[PDB]
Design a binder for this molecule. Structure first.
Ligand SMILES: NC(=O)c1ccc2cccc(O)c2n1
Length: 268
């Protein structure tokens, strides 16, 4: 390829291999993601493409809480996706690994931005299905979070999902026990795991039994309101979980900092 200059490997795993790149035409920072054709369980179309590209095109549209797909290419054995790349950036998993449990004010700003990103995906007919710290990029200058890696997502629908291939420890008890979930309520459970992770510095449950028991213990000092929001997101019955609107109207969620204030105060 002559359109992009390839830089260091940023990571690899279930999502494929992602390299740092630069778009040669205007020096835009990009991430260049290679997905092997035979590791794609899930195809859509517009000629057959990974669901991931279908879902990205449906959400890649002005609102910047979701990484944008700038271009894609097909190769004999893979697809290559050209994605936005903020710079400097750190994913939330590394950030929490380095900084430990986040102060509530900072978790509140981050969590709120996740919720706007996920509402956007949903408004666009897309369910992420793998919301977790490793799939959230922090633009450290602007304090803006971006959801990445739609490679386990699906078109949003209102009937039951019986397949899943996101991250188990973020998956709800109905998936664990029955291999069934509805998209919104599973997304909210993963948001409870995510919010506990932000405020405690690690995820609450490691084991199937703990997921199914849904008993939440706090190892860090966490406000009653935050604990209540988390415990609500993690209701065992899917229909007892809050909607996005109820999450965002929760008292813990009030007075969120703007992303810019967030970076000035907490990211320097
Ligand atoms: N949607 C994507 O998987 C994606 C998009 C952009 C990325 C930027 C930096 C590091 C990454 O792992 C990235 N992954």
């Amino acid at each position: 390829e002559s359109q992009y200059q390839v830089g260091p490997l940023l990571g690899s795993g279930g999502f494929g291999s992602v390299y740092s790149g630069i778009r040669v035409s205007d020096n835009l920072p990009v991430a260049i993601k290679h997905v092997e054709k035979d590791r794609i369980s899930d195809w859509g179309e517009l000629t057959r493409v990974p669901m991931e590209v279908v879902l990205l095109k449906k959400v890649s549209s002005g609102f910047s809480g979701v990484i944008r797909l700038l271009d894609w290419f097909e190769r004999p054995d893979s697809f290559v996706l050209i994605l936005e790349r903020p710079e400097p950036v750190q994913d939330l998993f590394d950030f929490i690994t380095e900084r430990g449990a986040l102060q509530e004010e900072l978790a509140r700003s981050f969590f709120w931005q996740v919720l706007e990103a996920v509402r956007h995906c949903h408004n666009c007919g897309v369910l992420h299905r793998d919301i977790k710290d490793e799939n959230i990029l922090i633009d450290l200058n602007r304090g803006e979070l971006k959801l990445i890696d739609f490679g386990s997502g699906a078109l949003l629908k209102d009937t039951v999902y019986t397949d899943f291939d996101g991250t188990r420890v973020y998956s709800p008890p109905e998936w664990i026990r029955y291999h069934r979930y509805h998209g919104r309520s599973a997304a909210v459970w993963s948001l409870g795991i995510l919010l506990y992770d932000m405020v405690c510095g690690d995820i609450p449950f490691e084991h199937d039994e703990e997921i199914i028991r849904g008993q939440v213990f706090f190892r860090q000092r966490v406000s009653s309101e935050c604990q209540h929001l988390i415990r609500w997101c993690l209701a065992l019955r899917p229909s007892d979980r809050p909607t996005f609107e109820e999450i965002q109207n929760h008292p813990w969620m009030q007075d969120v900092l703007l992303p810019q204030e967030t970076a000035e105060i907490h990211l320097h």
